[PDB]
Amino acid sequence: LYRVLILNDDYTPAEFVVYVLERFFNKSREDATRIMLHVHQNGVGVCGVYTYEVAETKVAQVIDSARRHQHPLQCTMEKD
Amino acid sequence: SLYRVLILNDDYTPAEFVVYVLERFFNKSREDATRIMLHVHQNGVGVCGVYTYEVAETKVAQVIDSARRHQHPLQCTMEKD
Ligand SMILES: [Mg+2]
Ligand SMILES: [Mg+2]
């Protein structure tokens, strides 16, 4: 399986990161907030764990959403 | 439970210092250190090693200490493996 990560940056609004986590990773508001804070403080955080193709899909959906909303948010994946 | 130690890319820390860190604190061969350094540059983040919780914390701390004493903002953290 493969974990999907988001990386911190100084441009993407916190509220957008929460939105991404809720929408694309089905996080509750509190859990999304938790992960958003963790990424802000530590530079990176885990959004979910999926089979390879599904991880690729989620990474792509996040990047598509971010860029269309004019945010440079970086999303990537690693073997879990 | 084991924990992976990660570094994050930045635009300031020199490539050669990252290789030095990988060799000094994570027992990487020159080739592996170079490849991880390049991977982090390309991907934004990369895995330095996997250790028990407290050893991972120790490595993270040693990297931050070394980086700041070398005048570099290199970010290092850990996650459950
Ligand atoms: Mg694992
Ligand atoms: Mg990771």
Swiss-Prot record, chain A:
The organism's superkingdom is given as Bacteria
GO terms classed as biological process: protein catabolic process; proteolysis
User: What does this chain do?
Assistant: Involved in the modulation of the specificity of the ClpAP-mediated ATP-dependent protein degradation.
* SUBUNIT field: Binds to the N-terminal domain of the chaperone ClpA.
Q: Give the species this sequence originates from.
A: Caulobacter vibrioides (strain ATCC 19089 / CIP 103742 / CB 15)
Q: Which family does it belong to?
A: Belongs to the ClpS family.
Protein name according to UniProt? ATP-dependent Clp protease adapter protein ClpS
Mapped onto the parent protein, the portion here is: 40 to 119 of 119
From Swiss-Prot, chain B:
Q: GO:BP terms for this protein?
A: protein catabolic process; proteolysis
Q: Which domain of life is it from?
A: Bacteria
* Main function: Involved in the modulation of the specificity of the ClpAP-mediated ATP-dependent protein degradation.
Quaternary structure and partners: Binds to the N-terminal domain of the chaperone ClpA.
Q: Which family does it belong to?
A: Belongs to the ClpS family.
Instruction: Specify the protein name.
Output: ATP-dependent Clp protease adapter protein ClpS
Species for this entry? Caulobacter vibrioides (strain ATCC 19089 / CIP 103742 / CB 15) (Caulobacter crescentus)
Taxonomic lineage of the native organism: Bacteria, Pseudomonadati, Pseudomonadota, Alphaproteobacteria, Caulobacterales
Gene name of the encoded protein: clpS
In terms of the whole protein, what range is present?
A: 39 to 119 of 119
